[PDB]
Amino acid sequence: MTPLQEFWHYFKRNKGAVVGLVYVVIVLFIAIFANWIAPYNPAEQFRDALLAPPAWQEGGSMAHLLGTDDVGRDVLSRLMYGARLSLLVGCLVVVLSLIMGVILGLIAGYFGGLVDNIIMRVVDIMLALPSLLLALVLVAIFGPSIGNAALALTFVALPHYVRLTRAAVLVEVNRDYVTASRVAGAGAMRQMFINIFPNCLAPLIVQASLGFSNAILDMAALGFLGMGAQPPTPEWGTMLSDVLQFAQSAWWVVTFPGLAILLTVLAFNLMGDGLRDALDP
Amino acid sequence: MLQFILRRLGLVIPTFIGITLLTFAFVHMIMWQQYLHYIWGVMHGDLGISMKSRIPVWEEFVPRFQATLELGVCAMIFATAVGIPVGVLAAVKRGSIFDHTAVGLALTGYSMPIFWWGMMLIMLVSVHWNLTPVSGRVSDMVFLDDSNPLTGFMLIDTAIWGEDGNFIDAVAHMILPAIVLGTIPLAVIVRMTRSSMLEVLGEDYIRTARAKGLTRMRVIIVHALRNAMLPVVTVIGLQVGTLLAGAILTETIFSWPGLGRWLIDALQRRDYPVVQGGVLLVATMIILVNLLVDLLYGVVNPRIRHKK
Amino acid sequence: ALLNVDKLSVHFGDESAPFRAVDRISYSVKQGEVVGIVGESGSGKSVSSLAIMGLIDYPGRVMAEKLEFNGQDLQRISEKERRNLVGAEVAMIFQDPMTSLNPCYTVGFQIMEAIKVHQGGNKSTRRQRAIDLLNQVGIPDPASRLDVYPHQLSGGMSQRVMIAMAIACRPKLLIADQPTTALDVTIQAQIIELLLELQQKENMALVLITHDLALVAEAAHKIIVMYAGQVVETGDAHAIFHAPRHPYTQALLRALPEFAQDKERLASLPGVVPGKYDRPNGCLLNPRCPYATDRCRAEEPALNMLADGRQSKCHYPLDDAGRPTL
């Protein structure tokens, strides 16, 4: 069949993948239209209600579906605006780490030699310290903010995509079709971007979905530690910054931000193995 | 083997000189021979003074390294002892309810916010079911006599010199930290064990193993699992490197004495000397762990062992 | 007969529309006989061997009327009892010698394991037997060879270890699936020579399955020709490649350089082998056959037993002049 419809016919076998894609779609629609769908403004402090339970719990109120935080702010409206910032940072982290990482991986894998040694020793130095710890070192030097966290995450996600692109390119460059085009007269820009790139594209489409998973986990972690976004911002990580005090007083405040994160990341991992199943025989 | 391990050393040394130069750039900017003087400082143990304690970064690092290593070996002993059997079993039983449950739970663990997972277990199994202690490496009831040659490892010290019940405290405080930290390692090990086992169960040497008339047990345990453990050995190395990201998150909620809590407190207080010296001490230990794992891969793998 | 296959069938996929990888085949092997099985890709050769061995896995299903080996019905015996036959009365050699041996264990472990499972014995007697057995396959310096890992062998040496490991317990039948593909011509001559010296010294039957007709014409007594998952001709080696009784055997010979008058063009059949969706009604060669007639689209041909003792799956078996007996 045609490559797009053959991909969908195989992807639809993995039901879990379809579930995940559904979820993804749903949260993207919530992220776009939050200003119309969400009950109240993310910053509005109520004071006639303060740490009040969910709508179904006794002493709760049906005006605040997922209850209220300790300074009087609705949890449901805050989770939906958290979705905007979490998916937007996922987009910048995955898009820039793909663009810069695939280019460096093709430049390293095809040209080889000195260029490969310089690129791979720099990537190996960049991976000599754990992902989150290197991002924390960068953010503490430049200052806690959503932009500085997104930039730090793009810079730390880059080496993974370089190493993965190179590994795919070295499996292609030894194959006879790359040699046949070299005999036919093709220049390096053609060989990389017109011949090798569409053949190594299969793993990168998987690693884009698995990249959204790590982008929103590490951004939530950054947020939790107070480095990723500042306390007024409605971000799922920030919402858990200081909540362990509420384990007895208010279970909803601790539960829902992290359940949302889990759901989101699980959905993207579901798509990741759905794409993997659709991209091999 | 020598002509393999000497090439791993050949890639390690340029990486190590890299971390010494980048950490030099950081301690200089917050006479090129000032790098020779700084690495003389590092090699003589003259890492800086932490600005809040006014104690050398090395004197602070040692105790916390120990406290992190207990939690690390418990997370890995849990993740390897539970994970490999579940991964083998799932691949042996492909398409069973077991196989779907194992794949679903491994996706669920690999997708999980580790700090939140800890708060859920603290809330469930220390607050609402009163089964485990809420925080710390050991309770205030434990007071070990300093006169004894203490190791600094709380499990060992409380087993050998503790009063009645003190080892039971030392383990009861450690099970939640280990289960929470070990969840991502366990999820990676179950996944990589399945995929590695299922590619091996497709190979022609297992058709030969069945054609010889072997029991299914020998085919899985002897023929399949040795070939399947080569990539498992590999990813266990990547996990014991990346585990300190889980340490920063878990040690914070559990108020554990540890390198994760000392580094993130230093970052939040802008105590640059602790993060400047602690980045070098973390990065050098990642290099040593990778170097040992590669040596382990060299002895296990006979393609690497015997070639030269 | 030692082996008695009757109406054997092997299917893959859903029972409403099965891939008939083997479709109602029936053949026998006698003690000490060499039997060739020949056919192009998609012909189904290997699947009968894998069915005897019990190597057809979960999505595939084996059905037969009689699958007797040595008087034991291979479809009724238990897993315990199958392991007393496989590797000790029936044994198999496979196509790729570089991947047929386990990378992680020495050649000596892989031979001494086969002896242990079927004959037991101490380390001393199992080592001695592996030494003797490497001597028997013509290995240079056996003693020093036991401690050699498979990646240290050449392809020819690795086939000699496969033969050693297969003959270890003195089987009655040895099966070889393309033992000399991707292997040099002078090594192929040595391996087939070795198998034929073993067939004479141990008196074992040898089933030798390959795409190369010339190797089989030299080695085999009796030849089976397979097309599209079913047997189309059976007969003596000398006669089948000199007066062929089936139009597929005739075409498969006229397509070989052996019959070409120098540069004169080779013959071939039109079309391609009928896979899962392309199955013709009537005779399976009917889309391709030069001699096709309406009976061959209405009615599947019987495996007709001819007066010279041979069999052809054709309505109009070829006379010695190479024309249909209309």
Added chain:
Amino acid sequence: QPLLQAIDLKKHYPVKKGMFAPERLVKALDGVSFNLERGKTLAVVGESGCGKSTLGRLLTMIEMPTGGELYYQGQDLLKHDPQAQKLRRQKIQIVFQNPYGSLNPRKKVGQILEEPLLINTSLSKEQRREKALSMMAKVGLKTEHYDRYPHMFSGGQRQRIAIARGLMLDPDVVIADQPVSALDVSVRAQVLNLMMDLQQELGLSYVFISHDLSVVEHIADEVMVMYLGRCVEKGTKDQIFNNPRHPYTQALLSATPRLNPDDRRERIKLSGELPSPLNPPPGCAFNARCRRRFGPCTQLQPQLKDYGGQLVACFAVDQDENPQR
């Protein structure tokens, strides 16, 4: 002037026995030479590791030689000059061993055939398509196949696409690296028939590399037999298959199986396995295996000499033909 002259082609790849060992040459090819003329097939035969596929790679300049001369009609192809690069890129082309790895699996058959014309010619898109359609026609594919991906084709049809890509610039020499080895008998026959019909229409010359002596016996005009990177015997097809002089040629032509009982030959019982090129034996490379082994064979390297119009390198033949030795 023959269409392609090879004079003393050598390929000596250097290698390391680990870091501390001195560099050592694997002499993968040494001292091959031939004349190829327009409208003929020259066959290269030998078992694995004989250098037969480092040759061909030299002839198409996939790899540059480490010595020798390679002339198309008096012009040296081994110059780096762009004026010579255009000529070698048009005139000499390759068909690879593997039909599954030699086509780009993410390009349409039209693009696989148009790529040579984009890179080398002035042609507009409208003209380029008509060359590709006419070439598919010439190899026996259909117009509807133009849009299909290579995974939609059988192994035989994939080899027809690889031939059509080779023919696309209208060459004079096609190198054929074991081209019908992976194929079944009835599709092998069709690819051989096609290649001989193209030689009758275009006037191509083939350098045909093969482990199957039957196919060479069928299609070839001259044959080179090779062992451990050196030619051992060269002659017309008629001589090599009826009066083989070299002990290795006699071993190949007897280890090769044959159908007809009347076409059987004396059994020659070669021992051992092929020498590693990394650790080559002294004197004649066959001296570990040869029945005719004589005093010189462990001391000196034999050189090709003319005996009755058939070139052979063997000290025993020199003694048969010169009893005065």
